[PDB]
C-alpha cells in the first residue's frame, strides 16, 4: 500500500595510473657494458615496452 | 621512441681531513740510528699515511 524511493551507491573502478618504464635505464644505467651485455639477449625490452 | 637522460658534465670526490699528521720525519730523518743487528721496529698506525 505504501512505498519509499531510497538511493544506494556501487562504486566501479575505471583505469590506474597509467605507467611507463625505462628499460635500460633501470636495468643498469651509465655502463657501456650494460649494453653490451642487454643487445644481446635479443628482445626482452621491446617487448616489455 | 627512445628515453632521455643528461649526462653529467664532471665528477668531484670529497674524503675526510688528513688528520693524526703521521710522523715519517722522526723515522726517515734522525740524528741517530740504531745498529743493524740491534735494529729498532717502529709501528705507524691510527692515522692515514701521506
Ligand atoms: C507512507 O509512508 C510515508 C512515510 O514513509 C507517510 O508519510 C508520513 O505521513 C505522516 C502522516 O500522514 C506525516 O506525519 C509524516 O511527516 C510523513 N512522512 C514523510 C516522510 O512524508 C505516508 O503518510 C504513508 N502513506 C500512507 C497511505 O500510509
Ligand atoms: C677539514 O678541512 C676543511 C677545509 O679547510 C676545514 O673547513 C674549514 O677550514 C678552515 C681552515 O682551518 C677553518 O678556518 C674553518 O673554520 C673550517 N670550516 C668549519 C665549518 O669549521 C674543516 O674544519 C676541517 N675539519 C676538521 C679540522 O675537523
Redo the contacts with the bound molecule.
Keep these: 500500500?505504501?512505498?519509499?524511493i531510497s538511493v544506494t551507491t556501487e562504486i566501479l573502478p575505471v583505469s590506474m595510473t597509467k605507467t611507463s618504464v625505462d628499460c635500460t635505464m633501470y636495468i643498469c644505467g651509465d655502463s657501456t657494458e650494460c649494453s653490451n651485455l642487454l643487445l644481446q639477449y635479443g628482445s626482452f625490452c621491446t617487448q616489455l615496452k | 621512441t627512445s628515453n632521455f637522460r643528461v649526462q653529467p658534465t664532471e665528477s668531484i670526490v670529497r674524503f675526510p681531513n688528513i688528520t693524526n699528521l703521521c710522523p715519517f720525519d722522526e723515522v726517515f730523518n734522525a740524528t741517530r740510528f740504531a745498529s743493524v743487528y740491534a735494529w729498532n721496529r717502529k709501528r705507524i698506525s691510527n692515522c692515514v699515511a701521506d
Design positions: 500500500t505504501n512505498f519509499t
